[PDB]
Short mmCIF file of C-alpha atoms and ligand atoms in Angstrom, two decimals:
data_model
loop_
_atom_site.label_atom_id
_atom_site.label_comp_id
_atom_site.label_asym_id
_atom_site.label_seq_id
_atom_site.Cartn_x
_atom_site.Cartn_y
_atom_site.Cartn_z
CA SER A 1 -26.39 -9.00 -8.19
CA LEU A 2 -29.85 -7.59 -7.34
CA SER A 3 -32.91 -9.55 -6.58
CA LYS A 4 -36.35 -9.29 -6.18
CA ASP A 5 -36.03 -11.09 -2.84
CA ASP A 6 -33.28 -8.84 -1.43
CA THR A 7 -34.05 -8.08 2.23
CA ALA A 8 -33.29 -4.97 4.33
CA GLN A 9 -34.40 -3.93 7.82
CA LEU A 10 -36.90 -1.13 8.34
CA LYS A 11 -36.59 0.02 11.93
CA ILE A 12 -38.44 2.36 14.26
CA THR A 13 -36.89 3.57 17.53
CA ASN A 14 -38.22 5.63 20.47
CA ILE A 15 -41.41 3.60 20.79
CA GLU A 16 -43.03 4.49 24.11
CA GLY A 17 -46.29 3.38 25.62
CA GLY A 18 -46.55 0.06 23.81
CA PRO A 19 -48.52 0.97 20.68
CA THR A 20 -49.57 -1.25 17.79
CA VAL A 21 -47.37 -0.77 14.76
CA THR A 22 -48.86 -1.29 11.30
CA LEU A 23 -46.89 -0.87 8.07
CA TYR A 24 -48.84 -0.09 4.89
CA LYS A 25 -47.05 -0.72 1.64
CA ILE A 26 -47.61 2.29 -0.65
CA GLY A 27 -44.71 1.72 -3.10
CA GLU A 28 -43.86 -1.53 -4.94
CA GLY A 29 -40.34 -1.99 -6.27
CA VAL A 30 -40.53 -2.81 -10.00
CA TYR A 31 -37.87 -5.11 -11.36
CA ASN A 32 -37.23 -6.36 -14.93
CA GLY A 35 -35.68 -10.05 -11.48
CA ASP A 36 -32.01 -9.08 -11.78
CA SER A 37 -32.46 -5.36 -12.46
CA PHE A 38 -34.32 -2.65 -10.49
CA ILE A 39 -36.48 -0.32 -12.58
CA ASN A 40 -38.53 2.03 -10.36
CA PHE A 41 -41.24 2.29 -7.71
CA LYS A 42 -44.90 1.78 -8.52
CA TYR A 43 -47.01 3.75 -6.04
CA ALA A 44 -50.60 3.02 -5.03
CA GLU A 45 -53.27 5.05 -6.88
CA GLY A 46 -53.86 8.31 -5.02
CA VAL A 47 -50.37 8.44 -3.52
CA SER A 48 -48.67 11.71 -4.26
CA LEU A 49 -45.20 12.54 -2.95
CA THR A 50 -42.00 14.35 -3.81
CA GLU A 51 -39.38 11.69 -4.64
CA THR A 52 -36.59 14.18 -3.86
CA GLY A 53 -37.62 14.21 -0.21
CA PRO A 54 -41.19 13.56 0.85
CA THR A 55 -42.71 16.30 3.00
CA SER A 56 -44.63 16.08 6.25
CA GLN A 57 -47.75 17.42 4.48
CA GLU A 58 -47.52 14.64 1.89
CA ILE A 59 -46.86 11.88 4.44
CA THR A 60 -49.82 12.83 6.61
CA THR A 61 -52.01 13.21 3.47
CA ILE A 62 -51.21 9.61 2.44
CA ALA A 63 -52.03 8.35 5.94
CA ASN A 64 -55.37 10.19 5.80
CA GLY A 65 -56.08 8.37 2.50
CA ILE A 66 -55.13 4.98 3.91
CA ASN A 67 -57.50 5.45 6.84
CA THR A 68 -60.46 6.52 4.67
CA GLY A 69 -59.75 3.70 2.23
CA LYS A 70 -59.15 6.12 -0.71
CA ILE A 71 -55.58 4.84 -0.96
CA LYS A 72 -55.35 1.03 -0.93
CA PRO A 73 -51.96 -0.19 0.15
CA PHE A 74 -50.44 -3.18 -1.65
CA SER A 75 -50.07 -4.95 1.67
CA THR A 76 -50.53 -4.40 5.39
CA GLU A 77 -47.98 -5.69 7.96
CA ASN A 78 -48.26 -5.96 11.73
CA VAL A 79 -44.89 -5.35 13.38
CA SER A 80 -44.04 -6.44 16.92
CA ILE A 81 -42.27 -4.18 19.40
CA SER A 82 -39.71 -4.72 22.13
CA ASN A 83 -37.60 -2.48 24.34
CA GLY A 84 -38.58 0.67 22.41
CA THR A 85 -37.89 -0.55 18.88
CA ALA A 86 -39.61 -2.35 16.02
CA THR A 87 -37.93 -4.12 13.11
CA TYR A 88 -39.46 -5.30 9.84
CA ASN A 89 -37.64 -7.29 7.14
CA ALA A 90 -38.73 -5.82 3.81
CA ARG A 91 -38.73 -8.09 0.76
CA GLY A 92 -37.26 -6.04 -2.10
CA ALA A 93 -37.20 -2.30 -2.58
CA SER A 94 -40.46 -0.92 -1.24
CA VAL A 95 -42.01 2.12 0.45
CA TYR A 96 -44.21 2.07 3.56
CA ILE A 97 -46.20 4.32 5.86
CA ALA A 98 -45.99 3.20 9.48
CA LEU A 99 -48.75 4.13 11.92
CA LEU A 100 -48.32 3.70 15.68
CA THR A 101 -51.73 3.52 17.42
CA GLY A 102 -53.32 2.58 20.73
CA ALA A 103 -50.38 3.36 23.07
CA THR A 104 -51.58 2.45 26.55
CA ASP A 105 -50.09 5.58 28.13
CA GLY A 106 -52.32 7.83 25.97
CA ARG A 107 -49.61 9.16 23.68
CA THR A 108 -50.21 10.10 20.08
CA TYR A 109 -47.69 9.59 17.27
CA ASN A 110 -46.87 11.23 13.96
CA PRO A 111 -46.90 8.99 10.81
CA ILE A 112 -43.60 7.52 9.55
CA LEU A 113 -42.35 6.99 6.01
CA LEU A 114 -39.99 4.05 5.60
CA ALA A 115 -38.37 2.72 2.45
CA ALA A 116 -35.92 -0.01 1.44
CA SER A 117 -33.83 1.43 -1.41
CA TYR A 118 -30.87 0.68 -3.69
CA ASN A 119 -30.01 4.40 -3.86
CA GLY A 120 -29.20 5.11 -0.20
CA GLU A 121 -31.14 5.04 3.08
CA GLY A 122 -34.72 6.16 2.37
CA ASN A 123 -33.86 7.47 -1.10
CA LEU A 124 -36.89 7.40 -3.42
CA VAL A 125 -35.30 8.78 -6.65
CA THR A 126 -34.91 5.92 -9.17
CA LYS A 127 -33.51 7.76 -12.25
CA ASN A 134 -25.85 -3.47 -5.72
CA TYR A 135 -26.94 -3.28 -2.10
CA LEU A 136 -30.47 -2.81 -0.68
CA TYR A 137 -30.38 -0.20 2.09
CA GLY A 138 -32.78 -0.30 5.03
CA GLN A 139 -33.94 2.66 7.08
CA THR A 140 -34.14 3.62 10.74
CA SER A 141 -36.53 6.34 11.91
CA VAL A 142 -37.06 7.88 15.36
CA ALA A 143 -40.72 7.81 16.27
CA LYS A 144 -42.23 11.10 17.38
CA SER A 145 -45.05 11.33 19.90
CA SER A 146 -46.66 13.72 22.42
CA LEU A 147 -48.28 12.95 25.78
CA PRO A 148 -51.17 15.22 26.72
CA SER A 149 -52.21 15.84 30.32
CA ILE A 150 -54.86 17.58 32.35
CA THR A 151 -54.46 18.89 35.91
CA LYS A 152 -57.29 20.20 38.07
CA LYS A 153 -56.94 22.32 41.17
CA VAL A 154 -59.45 23.70 43.68
CA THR A 155 -59.24 26.61 46.10
CA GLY A 156 -61.71 28.14 48.56
CA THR A 157 -61.43 25.03 50.73
CA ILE A 158 -59.94 24.44 54.16
CA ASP A 159 -57.03 21.97 54.41
CA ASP A 160 -57.61 19.12 56.85
CA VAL A 161 -54.24 17.33 56.77
CA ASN A 162 -54.29 15.99 53.17
CA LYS A 163 -58.09 16.47 52.82
CA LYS A 164 -59.66 19.55 51.25
CA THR A 165 -62.82 20.41 53.19
CA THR A 166 -65.67 22.90 52.77
CA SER A 167 -69.05 23.95 54.15
CA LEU A 168 -72.63 24.58 52.98
CA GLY A 169 -72.81 27.82 50.97
CA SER A 170 -69.06 27.98 50.21
CA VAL A 171 -67.93 29.01 46.71
CA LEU A 172 -65.15 26.79 45.37
CA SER A 173 -62.83 27.92 42.58
CA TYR A 174 -61.61 25.31 40.14
CA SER A 175 -58.83 25.66 37.56
CA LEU A 176 -57.67 23.43 34.72
CA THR A 177 -54.36 23.42 32.91
CA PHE A 178 -53.35 20.99 30.19
CA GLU A 179 -50.63 19.88 27.77
CA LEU A 180 -51.73 19.69 24.15
CA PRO A 181 -51.24 16.86 21.72
CA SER A 182 -48.93 17.70 18.83
CA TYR A 183 -50.73 17.16 15.48
CA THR A 184 -49.19 17.55 12.03
CA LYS A 185 -50.85 20.28 9.95
CA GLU A 186 -52.88 18.00 7.62
CA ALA A 187 -54.28 15.71 10.34
CA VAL A 188 -58.02 15.04 9.87
CA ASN A 189 -58.71 14.49 13.60
CA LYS A 190 -57.44 17.43 15.67
CA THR A 191 -59.84 16.94 18.57
CA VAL A 192 -59.10 19.25 21.54
CA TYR A 193 -62.12 18.89 23.84
CA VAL A 194 -62.57 19.69 27.57
CA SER A 195 -65.35 18.55 29.94
CA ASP A 196 -66.26 18.61 33.61
CA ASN A 197 -69.31 17.61 35.59
CA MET A 198 -69.73 18.41 39.25
CA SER A 199 -71.20 15.89 41.70
CA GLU A 200 -74.68 16.79 42.85
CA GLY A 201 -73.66 18.52 46.11
CA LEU A 202 -71.95 21.29 44.12
CA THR A 203 -73.90 23.67 41.90
CA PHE A 204 -71.82 24.58 38.82
CA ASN A 205 -71.91 28.21 37.68
CA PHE A 206 -71.56 28.33 33.90
CA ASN A 207 -71.47 32.14 33.97
CA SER A 208 -68.28 31.90 36.09
CA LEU A 209 -66.43 30.05 33.29
CA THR A 210 -63.33 31.89 32.17
CA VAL A 211 -60.61 31.09 29.70
CA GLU A 212 -57.15 32.70 29.58
CA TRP A 213 -54.94 32.15 26.53
CA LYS A 214 -51.61 33.86 25.77
CA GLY A 215 -52.04 35.92 28.95
CA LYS A 216 -55.32 37.43 27.69
CA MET A 217 -58.82 36.81 29.07
CA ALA A 218 -61.34 35.47 26.63
CA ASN A 219 -64.83 36.87 26.32
CA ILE A 220 -67.35 34.09 26.06
CA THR A 221 -70.36 35.32 24.13
CA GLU A 222 -74.02 34.30 24.28
CA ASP A 223 -73.71 31.42 21.76
CA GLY A 224 -70.67 30.02 23.63
CA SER A 225 -67.94 31.41 21.39
CA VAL A 226 -64.67 31.80 23.21
CA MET A 227 -63.18 35.01 21.76
CA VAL A 228 -59.64 36.34 22.19
CA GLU A 229 -58.02 39.03 19.97
CA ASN A 230 -61.02 38.84 17.55
CA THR A 231 -60.18 35.14 17.16
CA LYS A 232 -62.55 32.36 18.10
CA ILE A 233 -60.40 29.76 19.88
CA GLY A 234 -63.26 27.53 20.97
CA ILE A 235 -66.90 27.17 21.96
CA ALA A 236 -68.35 26.34 25.35
CA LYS A 237 -71.72 24.93 26.38
CA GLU A 238 -73.41 24.23 29.70
CA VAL A 239 -74.32 20.54 29.98
CA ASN A 240 -75.80 18.95 33.11
CA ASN A 241 -73.87 20.24 36.18
CA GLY A 242 -70.85 21.27 34.12
CA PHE A 243 -69.68 22.07 30.61
CA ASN A 244 -68.13 20.94 27.36
CA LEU A 245 -65.57 23.17 25.67
CA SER A 246 -64.19 22.27 22.24
CA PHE A 247 -61.13 24.23 21.13
CA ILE A 248 -59.96 24.90 17.58
CA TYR A 249 -56.48 23.32 17.50
CA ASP A 250 -54.97 25.52 14.81
CA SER A 251 -56.15 28.75 16.55
CA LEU A 252 -54.22 27.87 19.75
CA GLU A 253 -50.77 28.40 18.17
CA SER A 254 -49.47 25.51 20.34
CA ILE A 255 -50.20 27.47 23.56
CA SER A 256 -52.63 25.86 26.04
CA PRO A 257 -55.55 27.88 27.38
CA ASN A 258 -56.14 27.98 31.15
CA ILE A 259 -59.74 27.38 32.26
CA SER A 260 -61.36 28.54 35.51
CA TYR A 261 -64.83 28.09 36.98
CA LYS A 262 -66.74 28.07 40.24
CA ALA A 263 -69.28 26.01 42.05
CA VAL A 264 -71.16 26.50 45.34
CA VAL A 265 -71.66 23.79 47.98
CA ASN A 266 -75.41 23.02 48.29
CA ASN A 267 -77.54 21.11 50.82
CA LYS A 268 -76.96 17.76 49.00
CA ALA A 269 -73.24 17.87 49.76
CA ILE A 270 -72.11 14.46 50.94
CA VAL A 271 -70.58 14.17 54.43
CA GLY A 272 -67.59 11.88 55.12
CA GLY A 273 -65.83 9.25 52.98
CA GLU A 274 -67.49 9.49 49.58
CA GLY A 275 -66.78 13.25 49.45
CA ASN A 276 -67.84 15.49 46.61
CA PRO A 277 -65.87 14.91 43.42
CA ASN A 278 -65.78 16.45 40.00
CA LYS A 279 -64.31 14.81 36.90
CA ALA A 280 -62.41 16.89 34.39
CA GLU A 281 -61.74 15.21 31.05
CA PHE A 282 -59.46 16.18 28.17
CA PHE A 283 -60.28 14.36 24.92
CA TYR A 284 -57.86 14.33 21.99
CA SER A 285 -56.98 12.04 19.05
CA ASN A 286 -54.43 9.23 19.37
CA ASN A 287 -54.85 8.40 15.67
CA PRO A 288 -55.04 11.82 14.10
CA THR A 289 -54.97 10.61 10.46
CA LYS A 290 -58.23 8.71 11.04
CA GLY A 291 -61.76 10.10 11.32
CA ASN A 292 -62.68 13.73 11.93
CA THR A 293 -62.23 16.40 14.58
CA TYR A 294 -64.93 16.02 17.23
CA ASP A 295 -66.65 19.22 18.33
CA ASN A 296 -70.23 18.29 19.20
CA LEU A 297 -70.84 20.24 22.44
CA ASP A 298 -74.05 18.45 23.45
CA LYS A 299 -72.17 15.31 24.31
CA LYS A 300 -68.56 14.45 24.91
CA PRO A 301 -67.08 11.94 22.47
CA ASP A 302 -66.75 8.17 23.00
CA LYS A 303 -63.20 6.81 23.44
CA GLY A 306 -59.19 7.24 17.50
CA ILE A 307 -60.25 9.42 20.44
CA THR A 308 -58.88 8.93 23.93
CA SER A 309 -58.57 11.06 27.07
CA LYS A 310 -56.73 12.12 30.16
CA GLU A 311 -58.59 13.04 33.30
CA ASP A 312 -58.34 14.52 36.76
CA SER A 313 -60.62 14.86 39.77
CA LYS A 314 -60.57 16.69 43.10
CA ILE A 315 -62.65 15.46 46.01
CA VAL A 316 -63.86 17.93 48.54
CA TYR A 317 -65.12 16.80 51.95
CA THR A 318 -67.66 18.03 54.52
CA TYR A 319 -68.57 16.91 58.04
CA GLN A 320 -71.54 17.42 60.32
CA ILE A 321 -71.76 18.18 64.00
CA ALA A 322 -74.02 16.17 66.31
CA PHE A 323 -74.68 16.19 70.04
CA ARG A 324 -77.13 14.85 72.60
CA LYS A 325 -79.19 16.86 75.07
CA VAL A 326 -79.92 15.23 78.46
CA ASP A 327 -81.21 15.92 81.99
CA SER A 328 -78.23 16.83 84.17
CA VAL A 329 -79.07 14.16 86.83
CA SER A 330 -81.05 11.36 85.18
CA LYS A 331 -79.13 11.63 81.86
CA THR A 332 -82.39 10.88 80.07
CA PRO A 333 -82.62 12.52 76.59
CA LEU A 334 -84.52 15.80 76.16
CA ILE A 335 -86.68 16.74 73.17
CA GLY A 336 -87.17 20.17 71.63
CA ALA A 337 -84.06 22.02 72.86
CA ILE A 338 -83.01 24.68 70.33
CA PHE A 339 -79.30 25.25 69.78
CA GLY A 340 -77.17 27.52 67.66
CA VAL A 341 -73.99 26.23 66.05
CA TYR A 342 -71.36 28.93 65.51
CA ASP A 343 -68.02 29.01 63.77
CA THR A 344 -64.83 29.98 65.59
CA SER A 345 -65.52 33.72 65.08
CA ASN A 346 -69.04 33.32 66.59
CA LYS A 347 -70.88 33.63 63.28
CA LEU A 348 -74.09 31.59 63.37
CA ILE A 349 -73.78 28.60 61.04
CA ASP A 350 -77.00 26.67 61.75
CA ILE A 351 -79.91 26.22 64.18
CA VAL A 352 -81.02 22.79 65.33
CA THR A 353 -83.75 21.30 67.51
CA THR A 354 -83.25 18.10 69.54
CA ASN A 355 -85.46 15.08 68.78
CA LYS A 356 -87.17 12.40 70.93
CA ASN A 357 -83.80 10.70 71.48
CA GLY A 358 -81.93 13.91 72.48
CA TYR A 359 -79.99 14.19 69.22
CA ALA A 360 -79.38 17.08 66.82
CA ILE A 361 -77.25 17.37 63.65
CA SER A 362 -75.86 20.43 61.87
CA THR A 363 -75.65 21.28 58.19
CA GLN A 364 -72.32 20.63 56.42
CA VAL A 365 -69.14 22.12 57.85
CA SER A 366 -65.44 22.25 56.99
CA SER A 367 -62.68 21.06 59.30
CA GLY A 368 -62.36 23.47 62.21
CA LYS A 369 -63.50 24.50 65.69
CA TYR A 370 -67.18 25.19 66.40
CA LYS A 371 -69.40 26.29 69.26
CA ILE A 372 -72.73 24.94 70.41
CA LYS A 373 -74.87 27.21 72.53
CA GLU A 374 -78.48 26.81 73.64
CA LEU A 375 -81.10 29.25 72.38
CA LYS A 376 -84.12 27.64 74.05
CA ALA A 377 -84.29 25.14 76.89
CA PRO A 378 -86.52 22.10 76.68
CA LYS A 379 -89.81 22.77 78.53
CA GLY A 380 -89.28 22.13 82.26
CA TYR A 381 -85.58 23.09 82.14
CA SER A 382 -83.49 26.16 82.81
CA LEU A 383 -81.48 27.51 79.89
CA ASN A 384 -77.89 26.21 79.74
CA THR A 385 -75.81 29.37 79.25
CA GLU A 386 -72.53 27.55 78.66
CA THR A 387 -70.81 27.36 75.29
CA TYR A 388 -69.70 23.87 74.21
CA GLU A 389 -66.73 23.63 71.90
CA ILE A 390 -66.10 20.86 69.40
CA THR A 391 -63.38 20.29 66.82
CA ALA A 392 -64.45 18.80 63.49
CA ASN A 393 -62.07 16.94 61.15
CA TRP A 394 -61.40 13.61 59.43
CA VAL A 395 -59.98 12.24 62.72
CA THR A 396 -62.88 13.40 64.96
CA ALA A 397 -65.65 12.53 62.41
CA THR A 398 -65.81 8.87 63.48
CA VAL A 399 -69.58 8.60 63.79
CA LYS A 400 -71.81 7.20 61.09
CA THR A 401 -75.44 8.26 61.23
CA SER A 402 -78.46 6.82 59.43
CA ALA A 403 -79.72 10.40 58.77
CA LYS A 406 -81.08 18.26 55.70
CA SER A 407 -82.55 20.96 53.51
CA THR A 408 -82.60 24.22 55.50
CA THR A 409 -85.56 26.56 55.17
CA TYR A 410 -84.53 30.17 54.65
CA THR A 411 -86.36 33.46 54.61
CA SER A 412 -85.09 36.87 53.55
CA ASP A 413 -87.48 38.47 56.05
CA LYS A 414 -85.50 39.27 59.22
CA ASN A 415 -88.72 39.35 61.29
CA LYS A 416 -89.48 35.71 60.34
CA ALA A 417 -86.13 34.42 61.64
CA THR A 418 -86.56 31.73 64.34
CA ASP A 419 -85.47 32.78 67.84
CA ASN A 420 -84.94 36.37 66.59
CA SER A 421 -81.76 34.91 65.05
CA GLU A 422 -79.02 36.56 63.06
CA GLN A 423 -78.31 36.37 59.37
CA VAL A 424 -76.67 33.08 58.33
CA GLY A 425 -75.85 33.91 54.70
CA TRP A 426 -77.12 35.16 51.36
CA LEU A 427 -79.60 34.11 48.67
CA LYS A 428 -79.13 34.79 44.96
CA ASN A 429 -81.45 33.26 42.31
CA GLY A 430 -82.51 30.50 44.72
CA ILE A 431 -78.95 29.54 45.74
CA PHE A 432 -77.60 29.75 49.31
CA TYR A 433 -74.23 31.42 49.90
CA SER A 434 -72.39 31.66 53.17
CA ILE A 435 -71.39 35.01 54.66
CA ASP A 436 -67.81 34.50 53.46
CA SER A 437 -68.99 33.72 49.92
CA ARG A 438 -71.24 36.81 49.60
CA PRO A 439 -71.86 37.10 45.84
CA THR A 440 -72.22 40.21 43.70
CA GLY A 441 -75.49 41.55 42.20
CA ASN A 442 -78.26 43.99 43.15
CA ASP A 443 -80.70 41.17 43.99
CA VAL A 444 -78.60 39.44 46.67
CA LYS A 445 -80.94 38.92 49.63
CA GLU A 446 -80.09 38.29 53.30
CA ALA A 447 -80.73 34.68 54.33
CA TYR A 448 -82.24 33.84 57.74
CA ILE A 449 -83.24 30.42 59.03
CA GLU A 450 -87.06 30.55 59.14
CA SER A 451 -87.73 27.19 60.79
CA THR A 452 -85.97 24.00 61.92
CA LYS A 453 -87.12 20.38 61.62
CA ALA A 454 -85.85 17.93 64.22
CA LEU A 455 -84.04 14.83 63.09
CA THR A 456 -86.34 11.84 62.56
CA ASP A 457 -86.94 9.87 65.75
CA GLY A 458 -84.99 6.56 65.66
CA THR A 459 -82.05 7.98 63.71
CA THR A 460 -79.02 6.03 64.92
CA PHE A 461 -75.48 7.12 65.71
CA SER A 462 -72.78 4.42 65.65
CA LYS A 463 -69.10 4.89 66.47
CA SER A 464 -67.10 3.76 63.44
CA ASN A 465 -64.11 4.63 61.21
CA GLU A 466 -62.37 7.96 60.50
CA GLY A 467 -64.27 9.86 57.78
CA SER A 468 -67.64 8.32 58.67
CA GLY A 469 -68.81 11.96 58.47
CA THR A 470 -70.32 12.86 61.84
CA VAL A 471 -68.48 14.49 64.73
CA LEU A 472 -70.50 13.65 67.89
CA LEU A 473 -69.81 15.73 71.02
CA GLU A 474 -67.87 13.58 73.57
CA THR A 475 -69.99 14.54 76.58
CA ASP A 476 -73.78 14.98 76.31
CA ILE A 477 -75.08 18.47 77.04
CA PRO A 478 -76.82 18.78 80.43
CA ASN A 479 -79.92 20.74 81.30
CA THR A 480 -80.98 21.44 84.87
CA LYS A 481 -84.61 20.62 85.59
CA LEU A 482 -86.69 23.43 86.94
CA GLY A 483 -89.19 21.48 88.91
CA1 LIG B 1 -37.38 -4.36 19.46
#
């Protein structure tokens, strides 16, 4: 006794991430209502009734999503506790698509059928069997790391002119061979206080370094695995999924801390993004390198924040404690390398360029007029904990001419194509020029300094610096 109105359960297990499940009927059961004849398939559907192949299943899904294949009906199926169940009316064949998982996972298509000839059995030459299928998905990821920084407890810190080395690794989506959207697309953009170096971009794949040519082609073993382009203060890099052989490339690049580096809480972040398809049988692979795609495309992301601080102090008369203008000070790192030169303002105050966590030294180069030179070195420790001052407040002026250095001062770093590098980040090239500080501008009169929270950005010396009046 067949009907029709015979029911059987079509079931999907291993549903993670809470996707939408849609069933598209691609095969109608044809009855005489008491005898089962065969399946009638939607126009454009092609499959092997003996055992449909992955190629065929994905192909059908592609057609459904373009509209080339019109299913006989579309069903929305609820989920719970990792499974979905649908009560089919009569022998019938469906493609299930799982889309929009909130954890970012991407799923393969599923073929489900209710059949009188055994679970899933499509050959038609009493009892209506259902079908249970285990859903299959992949969860991409992207992880960004930075080195070249100085650890301040759990904060990575840096200084003006430091070169920072970033690295990306990622886990690929798993796409079936016939998928129409195999987007594999990587982006980063550096915040404005870091100057991205596109020429530093490297790609390793299968333990081999890529050569990136002039037009952006990422070449390994005479194979183009992707194309890179410099965009704003960063890059877009679109890979060719099939060329990767399911092995993820590893991406590295550098940036150098510039004078716009933010001090304190906000820090200096990047934002690495990995775009892929979470509905790979819909649309087309995205590879436009001018502009990253909008989110059948979704993404994972990662960011590293790097911090800087600034050193401040006040210059006063040793007896009256009244503030002294125009005192010139050097600020040195722990090994006595000159970091910066500052001049005190009307209110006695000076502030350094951006520094990493660490110990520094403040030493006078020129007394204020009417005062004897203070020959003492003043030490100060800079870190998240000591940077409790918030100021309402530089762009240093360099020369490569040693004889134009203020106060006959030493070299503070290097210049290459307009960019400042610290001594410890001395870059390569035959046109790398010595950098000296040519002049110093005092801080604007009426700049305030208020004691405040950790990470405010400014480390103000505990005791003001005395000068002894000549008289
Ligand atoms: Ca369920």
